[PDB]
Symmetry: D2
Subunit: 380 residues, 4 copies
């Protein structure tokens, strides 16, 4: 019925054989056959299928209201498998500010294989329509994006893709299946870096993909079996375990996000704040129409580099590290950490200022996170 | 000094911090930074590098006398990363009977990206010279091959690749680093399905790659970080653990291989036997010059399908399952299991007869394995 | 500062060496020494100490405001280590309705070693005073107890123990450190079955012990090292991971407990309800004075055995299984499952009626759990 | 049939459900019941039984030719469970030089519970007969012992125990089930620190117990369930995995032991050598009659403390660390590490001289281990 119940009882995460209430960890590569070709339970070689991996795949398919799930060794392995649905000469449209790893994979790996890409401003969906070429085969969007949290209309993107015969893909990492379900809005394929919120404990690198399309699922299964970027069984188990608390974790994160944004907007040492919950944020209405909650990633401007570094050093409960979706609140400076190779003037033009700080809100007490960030900002 | 000592003390497989005599399992995705950009020990995000994975990479680099190691989520993920060194329009030469997964990846995935491939009989190395095109960039060989154990001259292949400016790659799965070291013979890149002998216990799916070439290593590291087919930390740990006994396991397997082949050659229900240790085997001399032991994979002909099935049912110590390199002796029928989609007449032309049986010799007692297979053959 | 923050940042659960934001899993038995007797980081043999186990021990010591933590292979191993503080001829007072495993250990194992025990009604603390013998050395209490949730005054029990020179022990499993902190109320030793709420995911069997007493800690460390009921490193890691969400899980459980109790009290198919939150419950005031929340275990009477079985079969979201503290809501019938060997008339005298049902509330949606249990009760 | 085959195919170490060729890791605490009291496969709570633990228990029962196996959290937890078969007032006879942890457990823990113990020289079995008291209930022997490798006659000890109504127990750690099978010689209970040779990779702390006696098995199962020193599932899995190579590892170790002893006997810097393979060793004939191989533990005298330390520093392939049964060769000095709290004059009287060195031979190349130790001794 309701989402918190579905997180516990959705998917197949018990052992039919013993009744174990958690998925057994099948640390195994191969399986006995009683007769040549007769598989006891459908398993024959762990690259092709492994029962613990099948469990986490059933979970992500259930949570995204899809039919087929796929677990990969990383988020970018999931993205690469999806891109491999295309051939040399095919074209992809993506949002302009896609994740740096996605940008790198597309422009430094897959363009060498003849895949063509264009990065356009999808916050106006007619930009997608203009960018469609006779060779376009795929539309790939993140919403909200990193680190400025730009929002793209999922339902309209799906309609455009359907009209023009494109495979539509949404990277749903930042919102999770708890708040945003792209397959329900007509999208062909949804994917996640499960490294972030889904695992939730900063202890698994993994990607997850879900679809309702039987033919796309067959193609993805073939790509996974042939290029072999599969998630192992221990990591699959830890993902299943982490997903159990996704609802509680996201709800705590959201309570803190709301109070933190209030504080940041009031604080004189903070300038622009970037988050889709802010009513003046571009496509705020679109976000609220396609999601019933918020990501825990917030970006905001302080004055300069020295102020950003001082902010990081003055906090007690914000941890300097890469990644997001931890139980810990994480803090970073995109201009120094993720966008550092981009020329400074171009960073500034794109809004990635020296003083732009990104936080990924964790599950600490809300009052503590607000007070800690506020007292640290008071030292500026 | 000697190989069995190198297996124990080669590579870095202890904890410098606590002194733990085994590699800690870093079930983690990200790492604290004390200052922005300052990494305590060089780690920042587990997709890019993870200390347990670094341990297994150091092991495979040491055992193959290379400088750089890479651990992937599967053997075919290692192969795919190596193929991704090339661009659309580049050409690869491979041996004619390459592993089915390699054949599938190349002809159903990478040809869609404009990679061109030719499968030629590399048992005569002048066949390679004839097949070189102006666009050829890579030579990829297995030796010995599956399931007929064809042998290719590694040193001559390396010389040809060097003269013609090709990247040379050897899939060294069947021989392992214990018996055959392609990098020592001039090969650029060596790779393994660690799923087989290296892990050794049928409980990890994994690939390993080693090279001495700094530039190829940089390119492989970029591909691994960008497409993300990385091995997780638990599987990395189990690989390090399994490799400790590689020498003892391979030596037991070899003692059994020799006695089993004697039995098969004497038995009236067995026709042709395929293994590089047989003195009339093509390129037997080449194999003995480039390896100081043998693979545990043997193929041999019985009369027909019914005889093969009866053989499988009559054995007590041979287990019907996919894969090789277990501690258990495994048995299979290629025409029914791995080559089944190929037309029967073409199978026969290629020597994959209905009665061709493949065994992967395990570490059971030699007398038991000989006697068991012999008594089972006596029922034919 | 606040409890939810302490759950994330309390204890030492990162790697000082690499900066890994999770505790490495030291799957190791022994440690290099650079010189005889010189330990790099204090580790020499994993039975004596293991760094992953040290992490979970630091967590439980922090959460209970103690100084020393100890991790055992099970809750009853923790209890047995604590009982082994005593000698033949020493006497223990315990509450009358102590956990069945504790009762069994004391009356079938430790009485064979000359430990004397008396089980008295500790809901009136003067019962403890009367039961003190010249040989009494320990007072061991659970609060609230199972399955009728009897409450014992912790502060008064600690005062009695101090005045009479007894070691005071509280089994704090049902309340967890999130709601009840016996060491703060003067108790010498607090212990948990971490199998229940602390691990929280039904996937670790483990016990945890904490104390502020240096001498008791030294004695417990000696007992643990000598009898060896230690928690392994993988289970220690999973405990550390599970504890991160303890606050969120307990708070969800408590919201559901309150609404479920309202429903049960209103329902005509339910008679007596047992839970310390009910204002007419014995020692309700005492509980509220020593805890700031509630356990998720509730017991309630339906008519008979057939009604209890029908209730179990009619629910969709209550799972029939042993144990408590899962993410799933669990349901059981003590008279058939835990108290079955006790004569029926004695069960009835003790209030363990044929129709007594115990539920352990999980983290499913509150409305779903209420509605599901209510519709199932409507079928009676 | 033969031992190396039994190590692979003995016990139940596959999954009947999926056919997985390795034992699944049941990281779980509890199990679904379809009806109250109906267990799908006999599992209800992991402390009582866990399927991965059941696998390793089946292995040790098979390898020792027993009927029942038990897996504990450590060797000393197995020993403690066995001692708990007795009551206050019962007496145990043990060999004089029993393992220090066993000595400590008995004399500092179990004597506080009224168990009486005597440590006698069991190398003459009539010493046992003299030591029998009217209250003696158990005879507990190690053979060979540590660190001087004293040998006790197992068959005669079993006969004495049977005649006098004693439970007979052999700690078979040093020999392993590969070479010595006490249950076959009439002993009631055999136990191991699986931390040593059985796990074999210095990465599990664990104990194992086997018996053929149904009544002793019932009592041990009750003790394990009640005091809870159980082995967890990950450690159980790693034990099953390590045992696969026990035969190969022990045989390599034995080849090295023989050559190393030859070297030590010839070397002028070495005085007495202690190992049961030496023909002048006390009870050499007894050992050869009850075992068909040797332990890898050897002790030998060099001149003094400084010589022992120099030996340790001069070796390349001998590692200073506690424990034995690693894949690495380990070296230690009992007088400084295990026997240090004993007065120096008493150490000398017992033969634990300042220059007594203990090595635990690993699986490195035999020539390397011989040459390394010899060149290190040459520096003295
Ligand atoms: O949760 C929501 O609000 C909407 N989700 C649904 O469509 C309900 N739903 C679909 C599959 C499924 C499995 C278990 C449970 Br419990 C609920 C389930
Ligand atoms: O690593 C990350 O997450 C940052 N991602 C990128 O580098 C994306 N990207 C690619 C070209 C480019 C130019 C300006 C800006 Br602003 C961003 C750009
Ligand atoms: O082993 C052989 O026969 C040949 N191999 C070698 O080149 C020796 N060798 C190279 C690196 C290295 C590390 C540890 C040990 Br121990 C030996 C090592
Ligand atoms: O799956 C496996 O291991 C078998 N590998 C293959 O299918 C390789 N392969 C590809 C075309 C082809 C034609 C005849 C024969 Br014979 C083999 C062929
Ligand atoms: O949490 C409460 O209400 C009371 N607890 C405390 O006494 C606060 N406290 C004690 C140790 C400690 C470590 C980290 C953090 Br964050 C808070 C800590
Ligand atoms: O297993 C469990 O949890 C139940 N625990 C017990 O059996 C405790 N216990 C011991 C004697 C006794 C008599 C009546 C009643 Br009511 C309970 C009793
Ligand atoms: O191995 C020896 O020399 C003696 N051992 C035996 O008594 C043979 N034996 C007993 C049980 C059993 C299970 C599998 C295999 Br294979 C062999 C087995
Ligand atoms: O720790 C270890 O392994 C060493 N074991 C012991 O301490 C055993 N032990 C107990 C009293 C005693 C007196 C002399 C000698 Br010699 C040994 C003695
Ligand atoms: Na489910
Ligand atoms: Na659709
Ligand atoms: Na090393
Ligand atoms: Na080279
Ligand atoms: Na902390
Ligand atoms: Na106190
Ligand atoms: Na078996
Ligand atoms: Na017997």
């Amino acid at each position: 019925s309701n989402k918190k119940t579905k997180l516990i009882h959705g998917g197949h995460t018990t052992d039919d054989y013993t009744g174990a209430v958690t998925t057994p960890i099948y640390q195994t590569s191969t399986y006995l056959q009683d007769d040549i070709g007769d598989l006891r339970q459908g398993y024959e070689y762990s690259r092709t299928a492994n029962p613990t991996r099948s469990s986490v795949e059933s979970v992500i398919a259930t949570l995204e209201n899809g039919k087929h799930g796929f677990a990969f060794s990383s988020g970018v392995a999931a993205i690469s498998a999806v891109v491999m649905l295309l051939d040399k000469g095919d074209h992809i449209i993506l949002n302009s500010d896609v994740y740096g790893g996605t940008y790198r994979a597309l422009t430094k790996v897959f363009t060498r294989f003849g895949i063509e890409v264009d990065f356009v401003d999808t916050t106006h969906t007619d930009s997608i329509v203009q960018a469609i070429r006779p060779t376009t085969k795929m539309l790939f969007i993140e919403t909200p994006s990193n680190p400025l949290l730009r929002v793209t209309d999922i339902k309209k993107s799906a309609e455009i893709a359907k009209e023009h015969g494109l495979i539509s893909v949404v990277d749903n990492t930042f919102m999770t299946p708890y708040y945003q379900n792209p397959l329900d809005l007509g999208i062909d394929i949804v994917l996640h870096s499960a490294t972030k919120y889904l695992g939730g404990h900063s202890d698994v690198v993994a990607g997850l993909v879900a679809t309702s399309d039987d033919k796309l699922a067959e193609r993805l299964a073939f790509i996974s079996n042939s290029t072999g970027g599969i998630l192992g069984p221990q990591d699959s188990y830890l993902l299943v375990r982490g997903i159990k608390t996704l609802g509680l974790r996201m709800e705590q994160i959201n309570r803190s996000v709301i109070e933190i944004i209030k504080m940041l907007q009031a604080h004189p040492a903070v300038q622009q704040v970037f988050h889709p919950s802010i009513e003046s944020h571009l496509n705020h209405d679109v976000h609220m129409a396609q999601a019933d909650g918020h990501t825990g990633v917030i970006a905001f401007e302080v004055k300069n580099t020295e102020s950003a570094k001082q902010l990081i050093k003055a906090t007690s409960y914000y941890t300097l590290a890469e990644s997001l979706g931890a139980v810990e609140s994480l803090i970073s400076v995109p201009a120094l950490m993720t966008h550092a190779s981009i020329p400074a003037d171009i960073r500034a033009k794109e809004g990635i200022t020296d003083g732009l700080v990104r936080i990924s809100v964790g599950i600490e007490d809300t009052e503590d996170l607000v007070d800690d960030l506020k007292q640290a900002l008071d030292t500026l």
